[PDB]
């Protein structure tokens, strides 16, 4: 139970690490072991079949070739078919939405000086606090209110999310989703590294790690309690900052000078006996509302879903904890108040699924695509270390840098 | 986020507790909350569908109406069909098996003065250590060799297990299994307590508990990380001693004067394209072998499985951790040597499932059917607190007493 190279984390970053490493002739003859505390690879990529009828994305769901060329290239590399992602339009702009577009354009020259303060305080410079609250609310992302989200970061959030990208004049970017779910890409990469000799040990959580001569000694625990020790010569931790902080490896202090934050996310998918929303011409439309649903998506004639973050992600999760009955009834109420129709005219769902991610988004509050432990030479890999914080593209960028660093260590 | 009565643990014990409590008129109008860290109820009762062709028992799998009258009463009370459990035959005892039968009989009077020493040392009085090892090994239960397992406990283990009960002249006891799996009983009890107003919160693990005036404050965590606080006036911890030690309740010192132990268990089921074992007339037979499989069961022409405990349970779990391929080739190697045939005359399995229980059996090292905390009044319910420690009957006995103690607290 040992290896030459070990990767902890079978998300898109770790699987892509193993892919680069196994493509290099420098790794010929070296064993490679991949761990993940979950029984299936993918991480924050989780595709599911809603009532066995349609494919849905409980995790990452959309991408843009203009923003994410490495992801586009990976979809092609593994012959994954893409489809148009329709939730990019915002023609029915409200007064507050048009006001924010104008305010952000008018305030942009002030980013050099005040770009580091919270987005809320930055927008408050336009017409006051109250006006800023109403403007920011109309974007549907509650993270924009948080004091740890600076003005610069918020311009990045607005300009990069398909529903609100027109607010910073990024209409040109196209958006696509996986025809069969991004899980097909995960499996394509897993099958690729497995065929190249990589061995997978799924269902094992890394608890601690120590230096052991020229290598490392890992302590893992299976999901059923089975304790396990693994010795390796090279170690990549393809896990996000929230997980790094639990391994007692002095993260982030001994890995970088930046600080890192995270945000919870919540998605709920509902399907019905009939596409009742067609009576309102809402198919392929997204509604942003000052309502706990926040963002409401109607996928053609198949289903609907909502997507929330920060305070509202916790709202729906706490609501879920009180029981599924009250949860579905709350959705019914908020759908009526959001669409302006009598609650009794909103039918009950035929089937539904929801997912809560305590750390759905992890972001840097300020450089290298991958990190090196000051004290041991372990490598850290995550989208949080790149210019694409919170996106799969960032995971691909980090994996490339992490594998380059390791091959450098190998040739040392 | 509160209740009058809270039960942690949705095994047969906790569910039975709720049934008794809800049958009492003193609980009319009181709210009942049931937590469990698993997403499904049942605990160590886990039924599954092997290749979608036959129901198997990854946990508890059989019972005897002579040893377990309360469990048969529950099966009947919930209209659960039973079927004959065939693995009771020991008609052609081997020399060392016959010798252990005679030894345990002759040494029986020595139990009063020496019954508390280890079974191995106790049996060594007959013909020495080597002869004792040969005899004990032929029972198929590695627990019989443990120093913590006294002679009194061993006599109970041999006389209460179907495969070897005839070694202590308990051949009269009948054995039965569930026609659809014991999960049908769990579902029956769950549906009943649910209809009576009990509300379930599955997927939540209790982390700590502290007194709060006349009630208690429970800190729980969902399987997705969601932190939850719950307040109750009356609490039952229907969890085993191993799970009690992980809490902040001063277990066991503040609950009883006895200590507790546990043993790991492992089951593995395999299905094939053909019932190849019929060529050897092994259907409905069980083989006990000086071989890592230990106990090999052939269920008619449907499937086969093996059952191990103690070091052999850990042997198979470590073997599983090294890879599925190595795990299945090891079974094939051991089946060949156990039947006296060549490895290549044993086909590869068509499908298989296994389960490792880190604490499959939990027992007392030496009285009340349920325990109570000295100060807080929290009640503890588990089979390990009864004369049937390690059996579902013990859970029913503990539940009855635990419900009794809680009702005494309600009416105080
Ligand atoms: C709801 C929602 C919605 C979106 C997104 C996320 C979420 C939650 N994302 C972001 C995207 O999911 C994310 O950027 C990448 O999946 C990150 O992949 P990584 O492999 O870097 O981490 P990721 O978190 O995916 O994987 C880390 C892996 O490490 C494992 N692990 C962690 N700690 C461990 C330990 N101690 N021991 C063993 N294993 C451990 C985990 O089990 C996990 O599988 C996204 N991106 C995008 O491009 N477009 C989009 O539309 C979205 N939308
Ligand atoms: C392989 C194998 C084979 C057998 C058996 C066990 C095993 C593992 N048994 C024994 C039988 O399974 C056992 O005696 C009872 O099912 C135990 O029921 P309890 O509800 O008391 O505990 P059990 O362990 O079943 O339930 C406890 C529950 O509490 C939950 N829990 C624990 N800690 C928690 C926390 N901190 N927060 C939230 N939830 C928590 C657990 O998830 C679990 O669901 C058996 N018996 C028999 O009569 N005949 C047989 O043939 C067998 N064979
Ligand atoms: C890719 C994401 C995730 C995400 C990145 N930055 C955020 C800021 C706030 C809320 C979600 C995100 C998305 O499609 O929302
Ligand atoms: C009911 C059980 C569980 C059990 C009780 N005591 C034991 C000692 C050794 C191995 C298993 C058990 C069984 O069917 O083996």
From Swiss-Prot, chains A, B:
Record annotation: effect of changing residue 161 to A: Almost no effect on activity
UniProt-listed GO biological process terms: antibiotic biosynthetic process
InterPro entries, A to Z: Amino_oxidase, FAD/NAD-bd_sf, Zeta_carotene_desat/Oxidored
Binding site for Mg(2+): 11, 14, 238
Catalytic activity: L-tryptophan + O2 = 2-iminio-3-(indol-3-yl)propanoate + H2O2; 7-chloro-L-tryptophan + O2 = 3-(7-chloroindol-3-yl)-2-iminopropanoate + H2O2
Industrial or biotech use: Violacein production is used as a biosensor for the detection of quorum-sensing AHL production. Violacein possesses antibacterial, antiviral, antimicrobial, antileishmanial, trypanocidal and potential antitumoral activities.
Record's keyword terms, sorted: Antibiotic biosynthesis, FAD, Flavoprotein, Magnesium, Metal-binding, Oxidoreductase
Binding site for FAD: 13, 36, 44, 62, 206, 392
RNA-binding in keyword set: no
Effect of residue 361 to A: Retains 50% of wild-type activity
Effect of residue 161 to N: Retains 8% of wild-type activity
Cofactor note: Binds 1 FAD per subunit. Binds 1 Mg(2+) ion per subunit.
Transmembrane segments: none
An MF annotation (GO) of this entry: oxidoreductase activity
Cofactor(s) annotated in UniProt: FAD; Mg(2+)
Similarity-based family: Belongs to the flavin monoamine oxidase family.
Self-association state and partner proteins as the record states: Homodimer.
Name of the protein in its database record: Flavin-dependent L-tryptophan oxidase VioA
Organism of this sequence: Chromobacterium violaceum (strain ATCC 12472 / DSM 30191 / JCM 1249 / CCUG 213 / NBRC 12614 / NCIMB 9131 / NCTC 9757 / MK)
């Amino acid at each position: 139970q040992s290896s030459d190279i070990c990767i902890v984390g079978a998300g898109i970053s770790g699987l892509t690490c193993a892919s680069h490493l196994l493509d290099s002739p420098a790794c010929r003859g070296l064993s490679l072991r991949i761990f993940d505390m979950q029984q299936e690879a993918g991480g924050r990529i989780r595709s599911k079949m809603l009532d066995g009828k349609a494919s849905i994305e409980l995790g990452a769901g959309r991408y843009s070739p203009q923003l994410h060329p490495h992801f586009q290239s990976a979809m092609q590399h593994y012959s994954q078919k893409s489809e148009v992602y329709p939730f990019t339009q915002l023609k029915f702009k409200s007064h507050v939405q048009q006001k924010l577009k104008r305010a952000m354009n008018e305030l942009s020259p002030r980013l050099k000086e005040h770009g580091k303060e919270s987005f809320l305080q930055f927008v408050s410079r336009y017409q006051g606090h109250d006006s800023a609250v109403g403007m920011i609310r109309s974007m549907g992302y509650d993270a924009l209110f948080l004091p740890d989200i600076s003005a610069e970061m918020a311009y990045d959030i607005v300009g990069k999310h398909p529903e609100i990208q027109s607010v910073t004049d990024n209409d040109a970017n196209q958006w696509f989703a996986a025809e069969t779910g991004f899980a097909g890409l995960i499996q394509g990469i897993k099958a690729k590294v497995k065929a190249a000799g990589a061995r997978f040990s799924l269902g094992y959580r890394l608890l601690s790690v120590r230096t052991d001569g020229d290598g490392y000694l890992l302590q893992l625990a299976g999901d059923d309690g089975w304790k396990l020790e693994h010795r390796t010569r090279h170690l990549i931790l393809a896990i996000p900052p929230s997980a790094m902080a639990g391994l007692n490896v002095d993260f982030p202090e001994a890995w970088s000078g930046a600080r890192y934050g995270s945000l919870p996310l919540f998605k709920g998918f509902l399907t019905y006996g009939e596409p009742w929303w067609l009576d309102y011409k809402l198919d392929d439309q997204v509604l942003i509302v000052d309502n706990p649903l926040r963002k409401i998506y109607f996928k053609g004639d198949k289903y609907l879903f909502f997507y929330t973050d920060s305070e509202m992600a916790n709202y729906w999760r706490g609501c879920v904890a009180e029981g599924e009955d009250g949860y579905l009834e709350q959705i019914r109420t908020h759908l009526a108040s959001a669409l302006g129709i009598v609650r009794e005219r909103i039918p009950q769902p035929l089937a539904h699924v929801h997912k809560y991610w305590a750390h759905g988004v992890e972001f840097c509050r300020d450089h290298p695509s991958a990190l090196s432990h000051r004290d041991s030479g372990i490598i850290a890999c995550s989208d949080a270390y790149t210019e694409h914080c919170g996106w799969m593209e960032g995971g691909l960028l980090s994996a490339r840098e992490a594998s380059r660093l390791l091959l450098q260590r190998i040739a040392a």
